Amino acid sequence: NQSKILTLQAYDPAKVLVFIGGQRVSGFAADTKIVITRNNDNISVHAGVDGEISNALSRDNTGVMTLSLQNTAKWNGYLAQWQRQANVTGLIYLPVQVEGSQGLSLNTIGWIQKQPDLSYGTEVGQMDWEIGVLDAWLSPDQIQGIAAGITGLL
Amino acid sequence: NQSKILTLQAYDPAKVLVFIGGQRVSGFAADTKIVITRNNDNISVHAGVDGEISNALSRDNTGVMTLSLQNTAKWNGYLAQWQRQANVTGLIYLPVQVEGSQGLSLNTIGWIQKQPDLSYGTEVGQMDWEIGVLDAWLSPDQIQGIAAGITGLL
Amino acid sequence: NQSKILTLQAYDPAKVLVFIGGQRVSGFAADTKIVITRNNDNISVHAGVDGEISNALSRDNTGVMTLSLQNTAKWNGYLAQWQRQANVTGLIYLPVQVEGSQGLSLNTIGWIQKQPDLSYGTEVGQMDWEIGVLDAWLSPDQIQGIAAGITGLL
Amino acid sequence: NQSKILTLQAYDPAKVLVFIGGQRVSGFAADTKIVITRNNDNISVHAGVDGEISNALSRDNTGVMTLSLQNTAKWNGYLAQWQRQANVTGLIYLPVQVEGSQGLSLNTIGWIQKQPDLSYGTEVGQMDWEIGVLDAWLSPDQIQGIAAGITGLL
Amino acid sequence: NQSKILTLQAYDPAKVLVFIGGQRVSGFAADTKIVITRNNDNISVHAGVDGEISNALSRDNTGVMTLSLQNTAKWNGYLAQWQRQANVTGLIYLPVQVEGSQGLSLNTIGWIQKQPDLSYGTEVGQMDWEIGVLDAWLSPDQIQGIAAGITGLL
Amino acid sequence: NQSKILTLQAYDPAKVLVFIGGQRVSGFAADTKIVITRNNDNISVHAGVDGEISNALSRDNTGVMTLSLQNTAKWNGYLAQWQRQANVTGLIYLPVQVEGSQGLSLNTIGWIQKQPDLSYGTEVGQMDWEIGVLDAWLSPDQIQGIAAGITGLL
Amino acid sequence: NQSKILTLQAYDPAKVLVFIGGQRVSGFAADTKIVITRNNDNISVHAGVDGEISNALSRDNTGVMTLSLQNTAKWNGYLAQWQRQANVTGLIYLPVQVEGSQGLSLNTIGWIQKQPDLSYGTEVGQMDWEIGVLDAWLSPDQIQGIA
Amino acid sequence: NQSKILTLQAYDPAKVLVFIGGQRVSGFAADTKIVITRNNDNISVHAGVDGEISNALSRDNTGVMTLSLQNTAKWNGYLAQWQRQANVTGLIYLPVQVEGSQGLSLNTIGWIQKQPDLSYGTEVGQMDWEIGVLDAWLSPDQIQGIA
Amino acid sequence: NQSKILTLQAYDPAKVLVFIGGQRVSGFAADTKIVITRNNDNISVHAGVDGEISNALSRDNTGVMTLSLQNTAKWNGYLAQWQRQANVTGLIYLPVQVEGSQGLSLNTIGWIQKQPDLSYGTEVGQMDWEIGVLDAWLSPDQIQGIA
Amino acid sequence: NQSKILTLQAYDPAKVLVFIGGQRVSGFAADTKIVITRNNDNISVHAGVDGEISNALSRDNTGVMTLSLQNTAKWNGYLAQWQRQANVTGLIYLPVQVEGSQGLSLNTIGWIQKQPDLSYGTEVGQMDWEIGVLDAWLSPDQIQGIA
Amino acid sequence: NQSKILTLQAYDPAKVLVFIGGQRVSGFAADTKIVITRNNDNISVHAGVDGEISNALSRDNTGVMTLSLQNTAKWNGYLAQWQRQANVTGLIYLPVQVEGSQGLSLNTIGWIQKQPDLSYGTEVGQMDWEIGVLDAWLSPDQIQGIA
Amino acid sequence: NQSKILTLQAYDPAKVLVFIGGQRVSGFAADTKIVITRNNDNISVHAGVDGEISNALSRDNTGVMTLSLQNTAKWNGYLAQWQRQANVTGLIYLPVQVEGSQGLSLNTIGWIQKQPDLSYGTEVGQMDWEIGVLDAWLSPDQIQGIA
């Protein structure tokens, strides 16, 4: 057996596009751009004494989308001003979209949950904004779909 | 006394086969492919003041099977689509099978419990899916069986 | 695509000005000068069983502003004396202002919350004063303002 | 004063013999073979306000005996099969014996408490079985006995 | 702008004088001589739902003064004997004074709170005595005083 | 000022003598021989709202004396046998004495509280016995005594 | 002794052919033409307390190939263009082949891992391009009589 | 052999031009004039347990450029003034360019990263200025026939 | 002095035989033929605070054996085939033997641990194959008079 | 070529003056008189995931200066006295100045950071005193024509 | 000068006797016969913040002794047998003694700590056996006039 | 030039006297007689974010002194006896003094920190004794004219 290349193209971080309200975000941090995590488990399990097993689905799809930006980036001002604008007017929701380069994507509604701490030091600082998401289901954008009707059994 | 070779063949990670729904999984992570753990202890112990000891068996065999895949692997799309398909239709169970190369095996029913977080960075990311198992009893596939009727005592 | 310089000037730590009561602070520590953190999340989320999502704003803007000074700095005496002066007379509030070099700024009222521990050793010690802030909203001082009326949607 | 050799022979790990049910265990891990620990303290102490001290002995001698085996070892199958055999038939107890090379020994009844997790990776995996013991009193096998009637005082 | 020397003299650890009961302490540890910490925050903050902020001063000035001495130092005997002398006679308070070299000072009443653990090993051991202080307000001994009437505002 | 030698003799670990029941212990571990720690603080402090301070002495002098021995040492057998002898007959107390080389000493009654875990590995193992002490007051054996009547004040 | 001549035809270094992307490389340095290495050893040994030994087979076979070229060579241009090509478009891989005149061959795909250090002085310099090769099993195919 | 002459015109080191800020540098050292390096390799490889391989494209392309000048050179003055200029005013960047007489060129912006070690002795010393370059993709433009 | 001649028959390096898998190795390098090492020392010393000393016997006796072959040797082919054989089929072990002409012998089983660095240049290169040997106790059997 | 003479007056090492505390230093070693270095580089680069680049200006400019003196020199006495002076009284700082005959100057304050290693043998030894300098910006003032 | 002759009888290296287990060692290497070292320094210094100094006496005095033997020596056989003897039976210790012809002696017990690296080539090799010695206090007993 | 003669009397290495415990040392090695070093630098610098600088004075002044003696020297006996003396009785300290013929002196107390490596071969060896000195401030007292 010979080793196989898992993809034809190369994963390019610059190809990952983040659109918050219809504008592209720029000025990201060094290591990680964005992290998406679900708040709660998908399926719960109830185990009886005799061994009977029953499960119930979870309808809580809220999640948190970390966003790292350099403190010198101009987008810090946009989010800071929008925070107060929403606080005064009362409108906090805005569309959020993420395009993957060689992975999953995301397209839902979101809001600003917490403002990151600010620290000034010898080197350029970093700010990790937290953006909520109404639904944290990562959707594919590939040829997937012809095999989902094959894995099905039982 | 001379050192003995514990096996004739060599443990080959590529020989470990994972079948989820009847299809072989491909595109694993770097270090660890799969981890299987039991949720609860096999036997509980009750110790009295005088020193009397009594034990009761545990009938909760539910377990968790971690599964690490590269974010560029195509199987991320299959699981993501199946998640929503099960959420809508209501069918979540599907067969799970694991074949060991020079160790124990597993063959039971399972389901997707939690979707791993997604992170984009300088290097290719990793996703650690969690798959539940109805029974987490690792079964052997060796010449074992002629000695189990020997260790028995008391 | 070519790499872009995120700024024209260079982030100079000496340009960050801290004004406590109308006087500039001097004699800072080595690594980090000041850290600003919010006490509570901006927006809370309530998730129902059926999946309905509702959110409520948070009106608690209190925060903590860490301040690191060398134990040989003269400003240690000023703060120490002001602590007892406020304790006796009963007036604890005083204006606080921070000017960013290539980042956000801050201008609110504050007070001394906790006096840092003092340690004497081989090398010069450090003291991390904690200064409270009535409002911990970092405000911009840039051309931001013409785009906040663009990101708005929904 | 001159340095003294604490023993005449040399501590040889291969000389440590473990007999579970009447058969010698083989195929141990790299660093540690077995670990024996008591569940509870031997003697409790009650201290009064005035300073009076009273103590009560503990009759709970249950303990846990960790056992590390390579996942390629054949003894994994024996224990796995015995687990289900005991679960079905209802007999879980079996004799356990440990012979020290230049240390203490152990000889009591025991049972399998928890099955270790299984992980497949680049290198050969390890499994740490947990075996219960009715009594975890490590007994000597040396010339000790002529001095125990000397240390006695008060 | 040119770099400025924060002081004319040099911070000399030997110039830090500790007077416990009227005698100078000698035989300190390697890294840190003394550490002074307040037990409770200076000012508490109560935040209402509407955003109203009110604060209350804290009158608990008790603190802990760590003191590190080599186990070979003679002062270990003095403190040990004084512990029992106070336990028998009932008098535990004694004056405590600290003189800073280029920093703050302290002069209050104190007592022995906890005796440090003793350990014997290859190298010389260390003991970290804990001395309580009635008031843990670090007072200055500098030209400070002409500016405290300037920072005042609001 | 010139550096001073804190002692005339040199701290020799071999000079530390431990007598348990009237016999000298031998066969210690590598790094640390014995550790003595008090269970509770010497003096408690009650702080009122107005600032009044009152303290109460603690009469709980129980402590724990860790004791490290090589698993090949013969004293493991003595303690193991004495454990069962005390368990059967009901007498657990025995004198304990420690002589410091250039530090404090100890002479009180003690008992075995917990038996250390046993582990067999590539290198010689270690066992850390825990011995209780009725009183954990470290007493001096030096010229101390002529100055304790000098530090007294207030 | 003449009964132990290990090579009946002198080893001519010019017979060693290297093809990258289907074009023959040329313009090599003074002493060494190529070097092929692996990153990971073949198997892992997990030895137990009492001497039980078990082994595992590796599944990372990637290696690194160094290619010495005089800095005045024309092939420096082709590699320099290729870097930017892949950085933007995202197509990195490219076939690689080696001919073992009287040794071991190689035939796999690879990519440019790093760019060398360009230096200018009183002498014509040198460049060490790193062509990471996806799979680095050497082939004895050039040798006759391998039963 | 004369059929493999890699350079039909002798490589003259004086043709290598370097412009910083728009003025031509001069006053170089004895052996090496410049050295150009990157900090990070081009792509990252994440190999799975069973051999699945996936690659990532780097986005940090900064490099470092060393510039050897005799300590008696006049250009030491211009760089020394520039350091203080940027330290106070906060303007650090400055265009940088290199001419690859018969090699690879370079054209980007850069800044002074560190100042060298000044030493005085019985011989005229040397200085190694570090000009960090924002983007370090070498250009083959000087080479003809690059299809 | 002639009364202390340590070898009455000159040490002929050609008498040192090496058999791997039952075939005699040949085609060695210029200076060193083999090197045998252990990984772990024989015993472990655990010394207490007051000087109590206790010792433990090791149970990992694996070693490594290096085998220098000219890169033009034919035996490079046999080892290269063997690597792929074991990587797929999972049979790694193979008997190893050494003859101590006037020294210490060795007789155990071993496997190929890593493959060397193949380099091509103006001179016939060299290869250092690593044959991990399961047990590495040297044998004095070739020496006479060992009472 | 005579049209590129970088120094029209020979560089005389004796013109390099060093003043510490207002007295001229003398009694130097054989090869190197002084060496001036910084501890920290000028700016810090924080590069984001997608390539966003931002820079920071350093605020620690301290450096170290080494001063080679023959161990028979008289100036060893003045420095040795100064160490004890500062250790007790706590006054460490002292003005430092350097004259760049045909190079870069320096003018700041400094202190003795460490004392050298004194060795006695068959030859007159050497000492390397470390004079930490508070601020280490080199000055081009000695150079004419710096616009 | 002849009034400072440190040795009135030439130092003959053959007078240095070494006995292991009661038999005299022989068959040494070319340059160095033995080397004796300690592992731990004699005392530990614990210095306080304000200058309080206190010292501790070490209780680990073990050392290591290296013994160079030509690989054709017969004594290689005795040591090789001894290793296996102790590995199985568990008796490791063995008396060791050294005679300081005109230096320091040694007399203690020791064991074989590690086995050397056996190499075969065009020249008679060498072996460095490590004989860990339980206690390594050198003895001046051979020297006369030690009051 | 004769107007800069740094020593009007030739430096005679035999004038350097060393007294340990009140007896004059003798029997030194070939090249270096002694070396004196400190362990810790004189002051610590704590620089703040915005450039605030503050300094601290060290309180650990211990150093190490190396003493090279031919292994045939008689003084090896005195030091070897002293080690055992202190190990048992616990008296380690001993006065130490050095005479700076035309350099810096030293006068303090010290102890034997470690014992050297004893080696026997075809040449008279050497020993490097480490005499830790409690306080290591060099004294200029031998120099005249120190105002």
Touching subunits for chain B (3+ Cβ pairs under 8 A): A, D, G, H, I, J
| Whether A34 contacts chain B with CB within 8 A | yes
**Type of residue found at C117:** D
All residues of chain D having their beta carbon less than 8 Å from the beta carbon of residue G50 are: 13-14, 16, 26, 28, 33
Q: Which of L67, L81, L64, L65 is nearest to L29 (CA)?
A: L67
Pairwise CA distance, residues H47 & H55, whole Å:
9
Nearby residues of G34 by Cβ (< 8 Å), 6 or more positions away = G16, G18, G65, G66, G67, G68, G98, I118, I119, I120
Pairwise CA distance, residues K40 & K60, whole Å:
7
CA–CA distance from C123 to each of C28, J94, L58 (Å)?
15, 21, 8
Resolution (Å units): 12.7
Pairwise CA distance, residues K20 & K96, whole Å:
5
Pairwise CA distance, residues C15 & B49, whole Å:
71
Q: Is F27 left (phi over 0), alpha (psi -120 to 50) or beta?
A: left
The pair of three-digit structure tokens given for residue E83, joined into one six-digit string: 């512990």
3-state SS assignment for residue D139: strand
The pair of three-digit structure tokens given for residue L48, joined into one six-digit string: 């703040």
L115 contacts K31? CB cut-off 8 A: no
Q: Which of G62, G111, G115 is nearest to G91 (CA)?
A: G111
Contact H105, G46 (CB under 8 A): no
Which of B5, B7, B13 is closest, CB to CB, to G59? B13
* Shortest Cα distance, chain L CAs vs residue F129, angstroms: 29
All residues of chain E having their beta carbon less than 8 Å from the beta carbon of residue C84 are: 137
- Tally of CA atoms within 13 A in the half-sphere of L50 that contains its CB: 22
CA–CA distance from A38 to each of A137, C56, J60 (Å)?
8, 20, 44
Pairwise CA distance, residues J62 & J130, whole Å:
13
The pair of three-digit structure tokens given for residue K108, joined into one six-digit string: 């203690």
| Whether D90 contacts chain H with CB within 8 A | no
Contact I98, I17 (CB under 8 A): yes
| Whether A106 contacts chain J with CB within 8 A | no
All residues of chain E having their beta carbon less than 8 Å from the beta carbon of residue J134 are: 3, 5
Q: Where are the beta strands (DSSP E) in chain H?
A: 18-20, 23-24, 32-38, 43-47, 53-57, 63-69, 94-98, 106-114, 118-121, 127-133
I94 has which bridge partners?
Answer: I110
Sign of CA dihedral G32, G38, G43, G48: positive
Which of B11, B14, B30 is closest, CB to CB, to G54? B11
Pairwise CA distance, residues D111 & D109, whole Å:
7
All residues of chain D having their beta carbon less than 8 Å from the beta carbon of residue F71 are: 102-104
Residue with tokens 């050039």: G142
Contact F62, D47 (CB under 8 A): yes
H44 contacts B13? CB cut-off 8 A: no
3-state SS assignment for residue B127: strand
**Type of residue found at C18:** V
Contact H60, H39 (CB under 8 A): yes
Pairwise CA distance, residues F70 & E22, whole Å:
47
3-state SS assignment for residue C58: coil
Residue with tokens 């200055």: E140
L127 has which bridge partners?
Answer: L69
CA torsion, ordered B93, B94, B100, B103, to nearest 10 deg: 20
* Shortest Cα distance, chain E CAs vs residue C55, angstroms: 15
B3 contacts G55? CB cut-off 8 A: no
3-state SS assignment for residue L132: strand
Backbone torsions φ then ψ of L14, nearest 5 degrees: -75, -15
Q: Which of E126, E96, E122 is nearest to E28 (CA)?
A: E126
Discontinuities after residues in chain A (C–N over 2.5 A): none
B132 contacts A37? CB cut-off 8 A: no
The residue of J92, J106, J113 whose CB has the most chain E CBs within 10 angstroms, and thus the best one to mutate to test that interface, is: J92
Q: Which long-range contacts (CB under 8 A, 24 or more apart) does L106-111 make?
A: L106/L36, L106/L133, L106/L136, L106/L138, L106/L139, L107/L139, L108/L133, L108/L134, L108/L135, L108/L136, L109/F5, L109/L133, L109/L134, L110/L20, L110/L65, L110/L134, L111/K42, L111/K43, L111/K55, L111/L86
Q: How many CB pairs under 8 A join C and K?
A: 3
Pairwise CA distance, residues J67 & I123, whole Å:
49
Backbone torsions φ then ψ of H116, nearest 5 degrees: -75, -170
CA–CA distance from L129 to each of I26, K136, L29, L109, L111 (Å)?
51, 15, 12, 15, 10
CA–CA distance from H143 to each of C136, D53, E123, G78, K105 (Å)?
59, 94, 69, 10, 74
User: How many whole angstroms from its chain centre is CA D110?
Assistant: 10
Length of chain F: 154
The Cα diameter of chain I in Å comes to 63
Residue with tokens 């009637």: D149
* Shortest Cα distance, chain G CAs vs residue D123, angstroms: 5
* Shortest Cα distance, chain E CAs vs residue L87, angstroms: 14
CA torsion, ordered D47, D53, D54, D58, to nearest 10 deg: 60
Nearby residues of A86 by Cβ (< 8 Å), 6 or more positions away = A92, A111, A112
| Separate counts of helices (H) and strands (E) for chain C | 1, 10
L43 contacts J59? CB cut-off 8 A: no
DSSP run (H or E) holding I110: strand I106-114
B83 contacts A41? CB cut-off 8 A: no
Angle at H21 between CA H16 and CA H23, to 5 degrees: 55
Core vs surface per residue J12-24: b (16+ CB within 10 A) or e: eeeebebebeeee
SS3 sequence of chain A = CCCCECCCCCECHHHCEEEECCEECCCECCCEEEEEEECCCCEEEEECCCCCEEEEECCCCCEEEEEEEECCCCHHHHHHHHHHHHHHHCCCCEEEEEECCCCCEEEEEEEEEECCCEEEECCCCEEEEEEEECCCCCECCCCCCCCCCCCCCC
CB atoms within 10 A of CB C4: 12
A99 has which bridge partners?
Answer: A17
Pairwise CA distance, residues K58 & J54, whole Å:
54
CA–CA distance from K9 to each of I96, K12, K13, K17, L76 (Å)?
53, 9, 12, 18, 18
Core vs surface per residue A59-90: b (16+ CB within 10 A) or e: ebbbbbbbbbbbbbbbbbbbbbbbbebbbeee
Cα first-last separation, chain I: 27
Contact E111, F41 (CB under 8 A): no
Pairwise CA distance, residues I124 & A18, whole Å:
56
**Type of residue found at K23:** Q
Contact K78, K88 (CB under 8 A): no
H55 contacts A10? CB cut-off 8 A: yes
All residues of chain K having their beta carbon less than 8 Å from the beta carbon of residue E31 are: 49
Contact of chains G and K by CB distance (3 or more pairs under 8 angstroms): no
CA–CA distance from D53 to each of D60, F65, F131, F133, I133 (Å)?
22, 17, 15, 11, 63
Contact C50, J95 (CB under 8 A): no
Pairwise CA distance, residues H121 & J28, whole Å:
10
Pairwise CA distance, residues F19 & F106, whole Å:
10
Identify the DSSP state of G76: H
CA–CA distance from J113 to each of E13, J56, J87, L53 (Å)?
17, 28, 12, 15
Pairwise CA distance, residues L2 & L12, whole Å:
20
Pairwise CA distance, residues L48 & L51, whole Å:
5
3-state SS assignment for residue K34: strand
Backbone torsions φ then ψ of G2, nearest 5 degrees: -80, -5
Contact F109, F133 (CB under 8 A): yes
